[PDB]
Amino acid sequence: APTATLANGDTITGLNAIINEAFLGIPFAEPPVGNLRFKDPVPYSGSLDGQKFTSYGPSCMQQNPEGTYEENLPKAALDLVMQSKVFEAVSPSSEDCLTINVVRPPGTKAGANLPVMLWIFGGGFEVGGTSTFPPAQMITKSIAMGKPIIHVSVNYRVSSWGFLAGDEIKAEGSANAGLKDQRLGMQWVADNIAAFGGDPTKVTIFGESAGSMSVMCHILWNDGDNTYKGKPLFRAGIMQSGAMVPSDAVDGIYGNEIFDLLASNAGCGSASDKLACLRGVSSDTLEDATNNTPGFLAYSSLRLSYLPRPDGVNITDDMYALVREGKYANIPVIIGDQNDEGTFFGTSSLNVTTDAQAREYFKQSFVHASDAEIDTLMTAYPGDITQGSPFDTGILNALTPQFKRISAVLGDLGFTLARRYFLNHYTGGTKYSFLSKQLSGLPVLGTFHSNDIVFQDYLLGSGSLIYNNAFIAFATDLDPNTAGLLVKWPEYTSSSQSGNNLMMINALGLYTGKDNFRTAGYDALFSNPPSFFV
Ligand SMILES: *[C@@H]1O[C@H](CO)[C@@H](O[C@@H]2O[C@H](CO)[C@@H](O)[C@H](O)[C@H]2NC(C)=O)[C@H](O)[C@H]1NC(C)=O
Ligand SMILES: *[C@@H]1O[C@H](CO)[C@@H](O)[C@H](O)[C@H]1NC(C)=O
Ligand SMILES: [Ca+2]
Ligand SMILES: [Ca+2]
């Protein structure tokens, strides 16, 4: 059976899956339960000696994506599904969920010094777990390429459990617990990966959506100091859909509103110390209270109840400002997007049909935007249905007169144009960028968010050439071009550069293009980034 002797002398046993060897469910932190709730993770102090790690542990508690303080069918329906004994069995979750998984090529031994790809899952900082991201496809392809890599994934707390904010959390120093879970896992990798055959100096961090934004936060963490015991925790990063988070401070307006609401929901509205009151309620009570705060699919949509927020200590300031000021780790990166990131999320506001309703929804969502800014946004992202997302689909997909428009805004501010802003200011290392149009023609959604996960972990498609091959070559040589693709991937310097600067994907394969689309929207959005923060 696969075996590894940890840093502390413990010898653990893994699972031989023939095509790979896996050590699943290794605890890396003490269970963040009871009075440890919402607090920084504590290193796991214990003996794993003689233990087997052959199964993924439970995921952290999950929030109902349709959750909200209102009562409705979608909410009721998902809750029915999520509280079912069958669901509970196929997808177990718990507050004791801080585990890490290591999967490697068969026959890998300590000292192999293989590059390490550390995965951070997406899920709108509200749902997610490591078990739904099979590494077999990545690993198998890495062996066939003669560029074997070791795959590592870490669970982290999501929703209220991991991203609670407000005055109290700030005062306590407990901001961004979920990001701190990810950081500890990185330290565990630095300390223990050599035992599994990986090289701690060849770690590439990567993630999708919420995970991609997590990677960005890790680049910006501690003002760019990514070292642990005198050595950097990662040498590169891959960002699949997501750059800086456009959020106000942890003690800002919305961070405080959500905290108070959750507190009222849990029955802590009258406590003098709501935080200690929240630590005392049962898991069921807390879970209920959380499902009564907006989930990412509810009307509020991407104005998330829980997400990374600057705290003045680990994330010292507005993330857009950190990027302009050079406060980041200096590493080579790959950051890309799916053509139609906002369509799925745009389905959350299908009761908005007129321009007057659109303007009001935008006003409600962006509390810091002036009417002039709102008017500018609505000029840059017009009612014209041929102009919205799914992009380039003409009069098709008109679920409502505003859907394609709202989808265009959501995708651009949340991901696509945010990426361009990062790329235009980042001088930390070499940059590579891609844009996928692999699913052009798919009704309603187009090349929507997360489809890349399918072509990276489940099915093979033209996109796999990038999601697997190119990514593996980057993690190995810090240049995606060593993958030996037919289309050379050009370095990205700025969006105003002459010549193609984007690697592109369609159903047939790869080709290059330019990152010069929707320049009007970019200015509308980023002339003053803080006007559109949540
Ligand atoms: C679309 O539906 C949403 C969600 O139900 C409406 O917003 C809610 O409206 C009720 C009644 O006014 C309020 O008590 C809730 O607080 C609202 N929820 C949120 C998250 O804001 C919204 O008004 C509808 N939009 C349109 C244009 O009809
Ligand atoms: C957060 O910031 C403080 C102040 O610089 C630092 O001591 C602490 O170690 C940081 N936490 C992490 C996980 O890096
Ligand atoms: Ca308060
Ligand atoms: Ca710097």
Coordinates of C-alpha atoms and ligand atoms in Angstrom, one line a residue:
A1 CA 0.0 0.0 0.0
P2 CA 1.2 3.6 -0.7
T3 CA 3.1 4.9 2.4
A4 CA 4.6 8.1 3.6
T5 CA 6.4 9.2 6.7
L6 CA 5.4 12.7 7.7
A7 CA 7.6 15.5 9.1
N8 CA 6.8 14.5 12.7
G9 CA 7.8 10.8 12.1
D10 CA 4.2 9.5 11.6
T11 CA 3.9 6.9 8.9
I12 CA 0.5 6.9 7.1
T13 CA -1.0 4.6 4.6
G14 CA -2.8 5.6 1.3
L15 CA -4.9 4.0 -1.4
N16 CA -3.6 2.3 -4.5
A17 CA -6.0 3.2 -7.3
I18 CA -3.7 1.6 -10.0
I19 CA -3.7 4.8 -12.1
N20 CA -2.5 6.8 -9.1
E21 CA -1.8 6.6 -5.4
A22 CA -3.9 8.7 -3.0
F23 CA -3.8 9.8 0.6
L24 CA -7.2 11.3 1.2
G25 CA -8.6 13.0 4.3
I26 CA -5.4 13.9 6.2
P27 CA -6.3 16.4 9.0
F28 CA -4.1 19.5 8.8
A29 CA -5.9 21.6 11.5
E30 CA -7.7 21.1 14.7
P31 CA -11.5 20.9 14.3
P32 CA -12.7 24.6 14.1
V33 CA -15.7 23.8 16.3
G34 CA -17.2 25.2 19.5
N35 CA -15.2 28.3 20.7
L36 CA -12.8 27.8 17.7
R37 CA -15.6 28.9 15.3
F38 CA -14.9 31.8 13.0
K39 CA -11.3 31.8 14.4
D40 CA -8.0 31.2 12.7
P41 CA -7.2 27.6 12.1
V42 CA -5.0 25.8 14.6
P43 CA -2.2 23.4 13.4
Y44 CA -3.2 19.8 13.9
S45 CA -1.3 18.5 16.9
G46 CA -1.8 14.7 16.9
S47 CA -0.5 11.4 15.8
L48 CA -1.5 10.0 12.4
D49 CA 1.0 7.2 12.9
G50 CA -0.4 3.9 11.6
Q51 CA -3.5 5.4 10.1
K52 CA -5.0 4.9 6.7
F53 CA -6.2 7.8 4.5
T54 CA -8.2 6.2 1.7
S55 CA -11.4 8.3 1.7
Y56 CA -12.2 12.0 1.3
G57 CA -13.5 13.4 4.6
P58 CA -16.7 15.5 4.8
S59 CA -16.8 18.9 3.2
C60 CA -17.2 22.0 5.4
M61 CA -20.8 23.1 6.1
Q62 CA -22.6 24.2 2.9
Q63 CA -25.0 27.2 2.4
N64 CA -28.2 26.8 0.3
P65 CA -27.4 28.8 -2.9
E66 CA -31.0 29.8 -3.0
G67 CA -31.0 30.7 0.7
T68 CA -32.4 34.1 1.7
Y69 CA -34.4 35.7 4.4
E70 CA -37.4 35.5 2.0
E71 CA -39.4 32.4 1.6
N72 CA -39.7 30.9 -1.9
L73 CA -39.9 27.7 -3.9
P74 CA -36.2 27.5 -5.1
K75 CA -35.1 27.9 -1.5
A76 CA -37.6 25.3 -0.2
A77 CA -36.7 22.9 -3.0
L78 CA -32.9 23.0 -2.5
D79 CA -33.3 22.8 1.2
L80 CA -35.4 19.6 0.7
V81 CA -32.6 18.2 -1.5
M82 CA -29.8 19.3 0.8
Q83 CA -31.3 18.0 4.1
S84 CA -32.1 14.6 2.6
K85 CA -30.5 11.5 4.0
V86 CA -29.4 10.5 0.5
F87 CA -27.6 13.8 -0.1
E88 CA -26.3 13.6 3.5
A89 CA -24.8 10.2 2.5
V90 CA -23.4 11.0 -0.9
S91 CA -22.0 14.4 0.1
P92 CA -21.3 14.6 3.9
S93 CA -20.4 17.9 5.4
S94 CA -19.4 18.9 8.9
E95 CA -17.7 21.7 10.8
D96 CA -14.8 19.3 11.4
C97 CA -13.7 19.4 7.8
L98 CA -10.2 20.7 7.6
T99 CA -8.5 18.0 5.7
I100 CA -6.0 17.8 2.8
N101 CA -5.6 15.3 0.0
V102 CA -2.4 14.2 -1.9
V103 CA -2.7 12.2 -5.1
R104 CA 0.4 11.1 -7.1
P105 CA 1.5 9.0 -10.1
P106 CA 1.8 5.3 -9.3
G107 CA 5.3 4.4 -8.1
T108 CA 6.2 7.8 -6.9
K109 CA 8.6 7.8 -3.9
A110 CA 9.9 10.3 -1.4
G111 CA 12.6 12.4 -3.0
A112 CA 11.1 12.3 -6.5
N113 CA 10.9 16.1 -6.3
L114 CA 7.9 16.4 -8.7
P115 CA 6.2 19.7 -9.3
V116 CA 3.1 20.3 -7.1
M117 CA -0.2 21.7 -8.3
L118 CA -2.3 22.8 -5.3
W119 CA -6.0 23.1 -6.1
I120 CA -8.4 25.6 -4.4
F121 CA -12.1 25.0 -5.3
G122 CA -14.7 27.5 -6.4
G123 CA -18.3 27.8 -5.3
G124 CA -18.9 31.4 -4.6
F125 CA -17.3 31.3 -1.1
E126 CA -20.5 29.5 0.0
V127 CA -20.4 25.9 -1.2
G128 CA -17.7 23.5 -2.3
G129 CA -15.5 20.6 -1.4
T130 CA -12.4 18.8 -2.7
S131 CA -14.1 15.5 -3.5
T132 CA -15.9 16.8 -6.6
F133 CA -12.6 17.6 -8.4
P134 CA -11.1 14.3 -9.6
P135 CA -7.3 14.7 -10.3
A136 CA -6.9 11.5 -12.3
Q137 CA -7.3 13.3 -15.7
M138 CA -4.6 15.8 -14.8
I139 CA -2.3 13.2 -13.4
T140 CA -2.7 10.7 -16.2
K141 CA -2.0 13.4 -18.8
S142 CA 1.0 14.6 -16.9
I143 CA 2.6 11.1 -17.1
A144 CA 1.9 10.8 -20.8
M145 CA 3.5 14.2 -21.3
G146 CA 6.6 13.0 -19.4
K147 CA 5.9 15.8 -17.0
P148 CA 4.5 14.1 -13.9
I149 CA 3.0 16.3 -11.2
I150 CA 1.6 15.7 -7.7
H151 CA -2.0 16.9 -7.1
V152 CA -2.9 18.5 -3.8
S153 CA -6.3 19.9 -2.7
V154 CA -7.3 21.5 0.5
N155 CA -10.7 21.9 2.2
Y156 CA -11.5 25.4 3.6
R157 CA -14.5 26.8 5.5
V158 CA -17.1 28.6 3.3
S159 CA -20.1 30.8 4.0
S160 CA -20.7 32.1 7.5
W161 CA -18.3 29.6 9.0
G162 CA -15.4 30.9 6.9
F163 CA -16.2 34.4 5.8
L164 CA -18.1 36.1 8.6
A165 CA -17.4 39.8 8.8
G166 CA -18.4 42.9 10.7
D167 CA -17.1 45.0 13.7
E168 CA -16.8 42.1 16.1
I169 CA -14.8 39.8 13.7
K170 CA -12.6 42.7 12.9
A171 CA -11.9 43.6 16.6
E172 CA -11.0 39.9 17.2
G173 CA -8.7 39.5 14.3
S174 CA -10.8 36.7 12.8
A175 CA -11.3 38.0 9.3
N176 CA -11.2 35.7 6.3
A177 CA -11.0 32.4 8.2
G178 CA -11.5 30.4 5.0
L179 CA -8.4 32.0 3.3
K180 CA -6.4 31.3 6.5
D181 CA -7.4 27.6 6.2
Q182 CA -6.0 27.6 2.6
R183 CA -2.8 29.3 3.9
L184 CA -2.2 26.7 6.6
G185 CA -2.6 23.9 4.1
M186 CA 0.1 25.6 2.0
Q187 CA 2.3 25.6 5.0
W188 CA 1.5 21.9 5.6
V189 CA 2.6 21.3 2.0
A190 CA 5.9 23.2 2.5
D191 CA 6.5 21.0 5.6
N192 CA 5.3 17.6 4.4
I193 CA 5.1 17.2 0.6
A194 CA 8.7 15.9 0.2
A195 CA 7.6 12.8 2.0
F196 CA 5.2 12.1 -0.8
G197 CA 7.6 12.8 -3.6
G198 CA 6.8 16.4 -4.3
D199 CA 9.2 19.4 -4.4
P200 CA 8.2 22.2 -1.9
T201 CA 10.0 24.7 -4.1
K202 CA 8.0 23.8 -7.2
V203 CA 4.4 24.6 -5.9
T204 CA 1.9 26.1 -8.4
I205 CA -1.4 27.3 -6.8
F206 CA -4.5 27.2 -9.0
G207 CA -8.2 27.4 -8.7
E208 CA -11.4 28.3 -10.4
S209 CA -13.9 31.2 -9.8
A210 CA -13.9 31.6 -5.9
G211 CA -10.7 29.5 -6.0
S212 CA -9.1 31.8 -8.6
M213 CA -10.0 34.9 -6.6
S214 CA -8.5 33.0 -3.6
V215 CA -5.2 32.6 -5.6
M216 CA -5.3 36.3 -6.2
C217 CA -5.8 37.0 -2.5
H218 CA -2.8 34.7 -1.8
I219 CA -0.6 36.8 -4.2
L220 CA -1.7 39.9 -2.3
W221 CA -1.5 38.3 1.2
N222 CA 0.8 40.0 3.7
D223 CA 1.5 42.8 1.1
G224 CA 3.0 40.3 -1.2
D225 CA 5.2 38.4 1.3
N226 CA 4.5 34.7 0.4
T227 CA 7.4 33.2 2.4
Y228 CA 7.2 30.6 5.1
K229 CA 10.4 29.8 7.1
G230 CA 12.4 31.9 4.6
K231 CA 11.1 30.3 1.4
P232 CA 8.2 31.2 -0.8
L233 CA 5.1 29.0 -0.5
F234 CA 4.5 28.9 -4.2
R235 CA 6.4 29.8 -7.4
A236 CA 3.5 30.5 -9.7
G237 CA -0.3 30.5 -10.0
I238 CA -3.1 29.8 -12.4
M239 CA -6.3 31.7 -12.2
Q240 CA -9.3 30.2 -13.9
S241 CA -12.1 32.9 -14.0
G242 CA -11.5 35.4 -11.3
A243 CA -9.0 38.1 -10.1
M244 CA -9.4 40.8 -7.4
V245 CA -12.5 40.7 -5.2
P246 CA -14.3 44.1 -5.4
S247 CA -15.1 44.3 -1.7
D248 CA -15.2 46.9 1.1
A249 CA -13.4 46.4 4.4
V250 CA -14.5 43.6 6.8
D251 CA -16.1 46.3 9.1
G252 CA -17.8 48.0 6.2
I253 CA -21.6 48.5 5.6
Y254 CA -22.6 45.1 4.1
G255 CA -20.2 43.1 6.2
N256 CA -22.0 44.5 9.3
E257 CA -25.5 44.1 7.9
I258 CA -25.0 40.4 7.2
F259 CA -23.5 39.8 10.6
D260 CA -26.4 41.4 12.4
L261 CA -28.9 39.5 10.3
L262 CA -27.3 36.2 10.9
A263 CA -27.1 37.0 14.6
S264 CA -30.9 37.8 14.6
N265 CA -31.5 34.6 12.7
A266 CA -29.6 32.4 15.3
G267 CA -31.4 34.1 18.2
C268 CA -28.5 36.2 19.2
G269 CA -30.1 39.5 18.5
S270 CA -30.1 40.5 22.2
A271 CA -26.7 39.2 23.3
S272 CA -24.3 41.9 24.4
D273 CA -21.6 39.9 22.7
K274 CA -23.2 38.4 19.6
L275 CA -20.0 36.7 18.6
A276 CA -19.8 34.5 21.7
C277 CA -23.5 34.0 21.4
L278 CA -23.0 32.7 17.8
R279 CA -20.2 30.3 19.1
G280 CA -22.7 28.8 21.5
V281 CA -25.6 27.9 19.2
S282 CA -25.9 24.4 17.7
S283 CA -24.7 23.5 14.3
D284 CA -28.2 23.1 13.1
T285 CA -29.2 26.5 14.5
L286 CA -26.2 28.1 12.8
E287 CA -26.9 26.2 9.6
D288 CA -30.5 27.4 9.6
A289 CA -29.5 31.0 10.4
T290 CA -27.1 30.9 7.5
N291 CA -29.6 29.6 5.0
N292 CA -31.8 32.6 5.9
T293 CA -29.1 34.9 4.6
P294 CA -28.8 35.4 0.8
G295 CA -27.1 32.6 -1.2
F296 CA -25.3 33.4 -4.5
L297 CA -28.2 32.2 -6.6
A298 CA -30.8 34.3 -4.8
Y299 CA -31.9 37.8 -6.0
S300 CA -28.8 39.5 -4.5
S301 CA -26.8 37.4 -6.8
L302 CA -23.1 38.3 -6.9
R303 CA -23.4 40.9 -4.1
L304 CA -22.3 38.0 -1.9
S305 CA -23.2 37.7 1.8
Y306 CA -19.8 36.0 2.4
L307 CA -16.5 36.6 0.5
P308 CA -12.9 37.8 1.1
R309 CA -12.7 41.4 2.4
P310 CA -9.7 43.7 3.2
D311 CA -9.0 43.6 7.0
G312 CA -6.1 46.0 7.2
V313 CA -3.8 43.2 8.6
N314 CA -3.4 40.3 6.1
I315 CA -5.2 42.0 3.2
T316 CA -4.1 45.5 4.1
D317 CA -6.3 47.5 1.7
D318 CA -8.7 47.6 -1.3
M319 CA -7.4 44.8 -3.6
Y320 CA -7.4 47.0 -6.7
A321 CA -5.2 49.5 -4.9
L322 CA -2.8 46.8 -3.7
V323 CA -2.3 45.8 -7.4
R324 CA -1.7 49.5 -8.5
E325 CA 0.7 49.9 -5.6
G326 CA 2.9 46.8 -6.3
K327 CA 2.0 44.9 -3.1
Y328 CA 2.0 41.4 -4.5
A329 CA 4.3 38.4 -4.8
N330 CA 6.5 38.5 -7.9
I331 CA 5.6 35.3 -9.8
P332 CA 4.7 34.2 -13.3
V333 CA 0.9 33.7 -13.8
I334 CA -1.8 32.5 -16.2
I335 CA -5.2 34.1 -15.8
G336 CA -8.1 33.5 -18.1
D337 CA -11.9 33.5 -18.5
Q338 CA -14.9 31.8 -20.1
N339 CA -16.5 34.0 -22.7
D340 CA -19.9 34.2 -20.8
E341 CA -19.1 34.2 -17.1
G342 CA -22.3 36.1 -16.1
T343 CA -25.1 34.2 -17.8
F344 CA -25.8 31.6 -15.1
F345 CA -25.8 34.3 -12.4
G346 CA -28.0 36.6 -14.6
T347 CA -30.8 34.0 -14.1
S348 CA -31.1 35.3 -10.5
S349 CA -32.8 38.5 -11.6
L350 CA -35.3 37.4 -14.3
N351 CA -38.0 39.6 -12.8
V352 CA -36.1 42.7 -13.8
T353 CA -37.5 43.5 -17.3
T354 CA -37.6 47.2 -17.9
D355 CA -34.7 49.8 -17.9
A356 CA -36.3 51.4 -14.8
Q357 CA -36.1 48.1 -13.0
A358 CA -32.5 47.5 -14.2
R359 CA -31.3 50.9 -12.9
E360 CA -32.9 50.2 -9.5
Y361 CA -31.3 46.8 -9.3
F362 CA -27.9 48.3 -10.1
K363 CA -28.5 51.1 -7.5
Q364 CA -29.5 48.5 -4.9
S365 CA -26.4 46.4 -5.7
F366 CA -23.8 49.1 -5.8
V367 CA -24.3 51.3 -2.7
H368 CA -21.3 53.5 -3.5
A369 CA -22.2 54.4 -7.1
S370 CA -23.5 57.9 -7.9
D371 CA -26.3 58.3 -10.4
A372 CA -23.9 59.6 -13.0
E373 CA -21.8 56.4 -12.6
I374 CA -25.0 54.3 -12.9
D375 CA -25.9 56.2 -16.1
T376 CA -22.5 55.6 -17.5
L377 CA -22.7 51.9 -16.8
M378 CA -26.1 51.7 -18.5
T379 CA -24.7 53.5 -21.6
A380 CA -21.6 51.2 -21.7
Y381 CA -23.9 48.2 -21.2
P382 CA -27.0 49.1 -23.3
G383 CA -30.5 47.5 -23.5
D384 CA -29.7 46.4 -27.0
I385 CA -30.1 42.6 -26.8
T386 CA -27.6 42.0 -29.5
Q387 CA -24.9 43.6 -27.3
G388 CA -25.2 41.4 -24.2
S389 CA -24.1 37.9 -23.0
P390 CA -24.2 35.2 -24.4
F391 CA -22.0 37.4 -26.6
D392 CA -22.4 37.5 -30.3
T393 CA -25.8 35.7 -30.3
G394 CA -27.9 38.5 -31.9
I395 CA -31.5 38.4 -31.0
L396 CA -31.4 35.0 -29.4
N397 CA -31.5 34.3 -25.7
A398 CA -33.8 37.1 -24.9
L399 CA -35.2 35.6 -21.7
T400 CA -36.2 39.2 -20.8
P401 CA -35.2 42.5 -22.4
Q402 CA -32.5 42.9 -19.6
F403 CA -31.0 39.4 -19.1
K404 CA -28.2 39.6 -21.6
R405 CA -27.4 43.1 -20.3
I406 CA -27.3 42.1 -16.6
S407 CA -25.3 39.0 -17.5
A408 CA -22.7 41.2 -19.4
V409 CA -22.2 43.4 -16.3
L410 CA -21.9 40.5 -13.9
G411 CA -19.4 38.7 -16.0
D412 CA -17.2 41.7 -16.7
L413 CA -17.0 43.3 -13.3
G414 CA -16.8 40.0 -11.4
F415 CA -14.3 38.3 -13.7
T416 CA -13.4 39.2 -17.3
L417 CA -12.6 42.9 -17.2
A418 CA -11.3 42.6 -13.7
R419 CA -8.6 40.3 -15.2
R420 CA -7.7 43.0 -17.7
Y421 CA -7.2 45.5 -14.9
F422 CA -4.9 43.1 -13.1
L423 CA -2.9 42.4 -16.3
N424 CA -2.5 46.1 -17.1
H425 CA -1.0 46.8 -13.7
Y426 CA 0.9 43.6 -12.7
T427 CA 4.6 43.6 -13.3
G428 CA 5.4 40.8 -10.9
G429 CA 6.4 38.2 -13.5
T430 CA 5.5 36.9 -16.9
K431 CA 1.8 36.9 -17.8
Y432 CA -0.2 34.6 -20.0
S433 CA -3.9 35.0 -20.6
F434 CA -6.6 32.9 -22.3
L435 CA -10.3 33.3 -23.3
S436 CA -12.5 30.3 -24.0
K437 CA -15.4 30.3 -26.5
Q438 CA -15.4 26.5 -26.5
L439 CA -19.2 26.4 -26.0
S440 CA -20.3 29.1 -28.4
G441 CA -23.7 28.2 -29.5
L442 CA -24.9 26.7 -26.3
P443 CA -28.4 28.2 -25.7
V444 CA -29.0 30.6 -22.9
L445 CA -25.6 30.1 -21.3
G446 CA -22.9 30.2 -23.9
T447 CA -19.4 29.4 -22.7
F448 CA -20.5 29.7 -19.0
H449 CA -18.7 29.7 -15.7
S450 CA -17.2 26.4 -14.5
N451 CA -17.5 24.6 -17.8
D452 CA -13.7 24.5 -17.7
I453 CA -13.9 22.1 -14.7
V454 CA -15.6 19.6 -16.9
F455 CA -12.8 19.7 -19.5
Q456 CA -10.1 19.6 -16.9
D457 CA -11.4 16.8 -14.6
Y458 CA -14.1 14.8 -16.4
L459 CA -14.2 15.0 -20.2
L460 CA -11.6 15.6 -22.9
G461 CA -12.2 18.5 -25.3
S462 CA -10.3 21.1 -27.1
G463 CA -10.2 23.0 -23.8
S464 CA -8.4 20.1 -22.1
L465 CA -5.3 21.1 -24.2
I466 CA -5.1 24.2 -22.0
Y467 CA -6.7 23.1 -18.8
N468 CA -4.5 20.0 -18.6
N469 CA -1.5 20.1 -21.0
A470 CA -0.6 23.8 -20.9
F471 CA -1.2 24.1 -17.2
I472 CA 1.0 21.0 -16.5
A473 CA 3.8 22.5 -18.7
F474 CA 3.5 25.8 -16.8
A475 CA 3.7 24.1 -13.4
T476 CA 6.7 22.2 -14.6
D477 CA 8.8 24.7 -16.6
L478 CA 7.0 28.0 -15.9
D479 CA 6.2 28.3 -19.6
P480 CA 3.0 26.8 -21.1
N481 CA 4.8 26.6 -24.4
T482 CA 6.8 23.5 -23.4
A483 CA 3.5 21.5 -23.7
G484 CA 4.3 21.4 -27.4
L485 CA 1.0 22.8 -28.7
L486 CA 0.7 23.8 -32.3
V487 CA -0.4 27.4 -31.5
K488 CA 2.3 29.3 -29.6
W489 CA 0.9 31.1 -26.6
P490 CA 2.1 34.7 -26.6
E491 CA 3.1 36.6 -23.5
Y492 CA 0.6 39.3 -22.4
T493 CA 2.1 42.7 -21.7
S494 CA -0.9 45.1 -21.8
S495 CA -4.3 45.3 -23.4
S496 CA -3.1 48.1 -25.7
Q497 CA -0.2 46.1 -27.1
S498 CA 0.0 45.5 -30.8
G499 CA -0.4 41.9 -31.9
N500 CA -2.5 39.1 -30.4
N501 CA -2.1 38.6 -26.6
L502 CA -4.8 36.1 -25.8
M503 CA -4.8 32.3 -26.2
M504 CA -8.3 31.4 -27.4
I505 CA -10.3 28.2 -27.5
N506 CA -13.2 27.2 -29.7
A507 CA -14.8 23.7 -30.3
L508 CA -12.1 22.7 -32.9
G509 CA -9.0 23.9 -31.1
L510 CA -6.8 26.9 -30.4
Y511 CA -6.0 30.3 -32.1
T512 CA -4.9 33.7 -30.8
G513 CA -6.8 37.0 -30.5
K514 CA -6.8 40.4 -28.8
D515 CA -8.0 41.6 -25.4
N516 CA -9.5 44.8 -26.8
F517 CA -13.2 44.2 -26.4
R518 CA -15.7 46.3 -24.4
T519 CA -13.2 49.1 -23.6
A520 CA -16.2 51.3 -22.8
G521 CA -17.3 48.9 -20.1
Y522 CA -13.8 48.7 -18.7
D523 CA -13.7 52.5 -18.2
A524 CA -17.2 52.7 -16.8
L525 CA -16.3 50.0 -14.3
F526 CA -12.7 50.8 -13.5
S527 CA -12.3 54.6 -13.7
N528 CA -12.9 54.5 -9.9
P529 CA -13.1 50.8 -8.9
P530 CA -14.5 51.5 -5.3
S531 CA -17.8 52.8 -6.7
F532 CA -18.8 49.3 -7.6
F533 CA -17.5 47.5 -4.5
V534 CA -19.8 45.3 -2.4
Ligands
LIG1 C1 -37.7 40.7 -7.9 O1 -37.7 39.7 -6.8 C2 -37.0 40.2 -5.6 C3 -36.8 39.1 -4.6 O2 -38.0 38.7 -4.2 C4 -37.7 41.5 -5.1 O3 -37.0 42.0 -3.9 C5 -37.5 41.7 -2.7 O4 -38.6 42.5 -2.5 C6 -39.3 42.3 -1.2 C7 -40.7 43.1 -1.3 O5 -40.4 44.4 -1.7 C8 -38.4 42.8 -0.1 O6 -39.0 42.6 1.2 C9 -37.1 42.0 -0.2 O7 -36.3 42.6 0.7 C10 -36.5 42.1 -1.6 N1 -35.3 41.2 -1.6 C11 -34.1 41.6 -2.0 C12 -33.0 40.6 -1.9 O8 -33.9 42.8 -2.3 C13 -37.6 42.6 -6.2 O9 -38.2 43.7 -5.7 C14 -38.2 42.1 -7.5 N2 -37.7 43.0 -8.5 C15 -38.5 43.6 -9.4 C16 -38.0 44.6 -10.4 O10 -39.8 43.3 -9.4
LIG2 C1 -1.7 38.1 9.3 O1 -1.0 39.3 9.5 C2 -0.2 39.4 10.7 C3 0.6 40.9 10.7 O2 1.5 41.0 9.7 C4 0.8 38.2 10.8 O3 1.6 38.2 12.0 C5 0.1 36.9 10.6 O4 1.1 35.9 10.7 C6 -0.7 36.9 9.3 N1 -1.4 35.6 9.1 C7 -1.1 34.8 8.1 C8 -1.9 33.4 8.0 O5 -0.2 35.0 7.3
CA3 CA -23.7 45.5 14.3
CA4 CA 6.4 45.1 -4.7

